[PDB]
Amino acid sequence: NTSAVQVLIEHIGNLDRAYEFAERCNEPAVWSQLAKAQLQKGMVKEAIDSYIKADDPSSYMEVVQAANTSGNWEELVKYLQMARKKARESYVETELIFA
């Protein structure tokens, strides 16, 4: 299961595919680096950020802050649920606060 997931890559997947082989795995990997690549290459995040959280990424800072203005609340508020969690200093919690 350490691959059936990250498969959501560029020349590796795309759209109604990337999130088609993620419900089978639990487990997985690449959550902070996948949000930076899936957010700068084709609109997805709303999808690639609503079927993974999986610990990381809480703030700081890029995806974290990003998700809030648009219009990602309902999942946004949950994205922090893990924040103060295996996590609790400034720039990261003062960020949760800020956030």
Curated annotation (Swiss-Prot):
It is found in: Cytoplasmic vesicle membrane; Membrane, Coated pit; Melanosome; Cytoplasm, Cytoskeleton, Spindle. The modification Phosphoserine is found at S90. Signal peptide: none annotated. The C-terminal third of the heavy chains forms the hub of the triskelion. This region contains the trimerization domain and the light-chain binding domain involved in the assembly of the clathrin lattice. Clathrin is the major protein of the polyhedral coat of coated pits and vesicles. Two different adapter protein complexes link the clathrin lattice either to the plasma membrane or to the trans-Golgi network. Acts as a component of the TACC3/ch-TOG/clathrin complex proposed to contribute to stabilization of kinetochore fibers of the mitotic spindle by acting as inter-microtubule bridge. The TACC3/ch-TOG/clathrin complex is required for the maintenance of kinetochore fiber tension. Plays a role in early autophagosome formation. Belongs to the clathrin heavy chain family. Clathrin triskelions, composed of 3 heavy chains and 3 light chains, are the basic subunits of the clathrin coat. In the presence of light chains, hub assembly is influenced by both the pH and the concentration of calcium. Interacts with HIP1. Interacts with DENND1A, DENND1B and DENND1C. Interacts with OCRL. Interacts with ERBB2. Interacts with FKBP6. Interacts with CKAP5 and TACC3 forming the TACC3/ch-TOG/clathrin complex located at spindle inter-microtubules bridges; the complex implicates clathrin triskelions; TACC3 and CLTC are proposed to form a composite microtubule interaction surface. This is Clathrin heavy chain 1. It comes from Bos taurus. The chain holds residues 1078 to 1176 of 1675 of the full protein.
